[PDB]
C-alpha cells in the first residue's frame, strides 16, 4: 500500500524556531476503516525557502547535506552539544573539518525509494524528525531508535 501522510505547504520562521503548517483538513473524514495513521511527511516546494545544499567529503560515508533557512541573517540548523539550535551567518563555503553541525547524512527511505531523511554528522545516533505540537508542526530532533510519541519523520522529496 502506497501510504502518504502530512503534506506541508509553506510556513516561515517565528522566534528563532521553525514552524510548518499542513493543508486544510476542515474536519474532512475518509470512508475507509479508520487507519489513516501517519508515518512520514515529505511534500513541499509548492512554489519559506528551506536551503538544502550538498557537500563532498574526503571520507566518504554518505552524502553530506546542509540545512539552512533565510532570515535577515541566514540561519543554519545545528546539533552542537547534543542540543537543537539555529545558528545564524553562513557556512564558510566548503567546510574543512568533517565534524561540523552544518553537514548531515541523507539515508534512503523504504517508502517508494524516493524520499530521504537526515542524520546528524556532529553526533552518532541522532535523527531529524517533526512531531505534532499544539496547532502547527515542530521540527524537533528525536532519536529514531526510540518510539517517542507518534515518531513522525521529516523527509523531503528529491529533485527529479
Amino acid at each position: 500500500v502506497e501510504d502518504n501522510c502530512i503534506n506541508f505547504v509553506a510556513m516561515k520562521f517565528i522566534d528563532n524556531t521553525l514552524y510548518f503548517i499542513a493543508e486544510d483538513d476542515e474536519n474532512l473524514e475518509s470512508d475507509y476503516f479508520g487507519k489513516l495513521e501517519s508515518k512520514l511527511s515529505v511534500i513541499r516546494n509548492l512554489n519559506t525557502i528551506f536551503i538544502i545544499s550538498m557537500y563532498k567529503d574526503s571520507q566518504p560515508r554518505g552524502m553530506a547535506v546542509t540545512i539552512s533557512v533565510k532570515c535577515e541573517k541566514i540561519s543554519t540548523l545545528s546539533c552542537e552539544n547534543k542540543i537543537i539550535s539555529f545558528k545564524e551567518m553562513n557556512p564558510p563555503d566548503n567546510i574543512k573539518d568533517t565534524k561540523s553541525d552544518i553537514i548531515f547524512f541523507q539515508r534512503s527511505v523504504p517508502g517508494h525509494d524516493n524520499k530521504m531523511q537526515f542524520e546528524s554528522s556532529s553526533y552518532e545516533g541522532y535523527f531529524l524528525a517533526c512531531e505534532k505540537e499544539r496547532d502547527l508542526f515542530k521540527l524537533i530532533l528525536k532519536k529514531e531508535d526510540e518510539l517517542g510519541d507518534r515518531s513522525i519523520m521529516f523527509t523531503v522529496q528529491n529533485e527529479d
Binding site: 493543508e23 476542515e26 474536519n27 474532512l28 473524514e29 475518509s30 470512508d31
Partner: protein, 88 residues
C-alpha cells in the same frame, strides 16, 4: 407475444471515486461528492441530461481544490438519453 431482450441494459452507476481511491466527506456539511452532485442537479438538470450532469460533476472535480477526489461512471449500459425533466 414473446421476443428477445438483453439481460442487462439501461444501467448506470456513478461511483464516488476512482477505483483504489478514498471518498471524503465534510463532517459539518455532508459529503463533498454528494453536495456537488446536488448543486449540479439543482442548477443543470433543466438543460442537460443525466450523463451530462454527471460530466459536469466530474469536471467540477477536475482541478483538486484542497484535497483530491474524482467520481467515475461505471457499467454504463444506457442506450438513450435520460432527461429528468423536473416539474413535467
Amino acid at each position: 407475444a414473446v421476443y428477445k431482450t438483453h439481460v442487462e441494459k439501461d444501467f448506470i452507476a456513478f461511483c464516488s471515486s476512482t477505483p483504489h481511491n478514498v471518498s471524503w466527506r465534510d463532517s459539518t456539511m455532508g459529503s463533498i461528492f454528494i453536495t456537488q452532485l446536488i448543486t449540479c442537479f439543482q442548477k443543470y438538470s433543466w438543460c442537460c441530461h443525466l450523463e451530462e450532469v454527471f460530466r459536469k460533476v466530474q469536471q467540477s472535480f477536475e482541478t483538486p481544490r484542497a484535497k483530491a477526489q474524482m467520481p467515475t461512471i461505471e457499467r454504463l449500459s444506457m442506450t438513450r438519453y435520460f432527461y429528468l425533466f423536473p416539474g413535467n
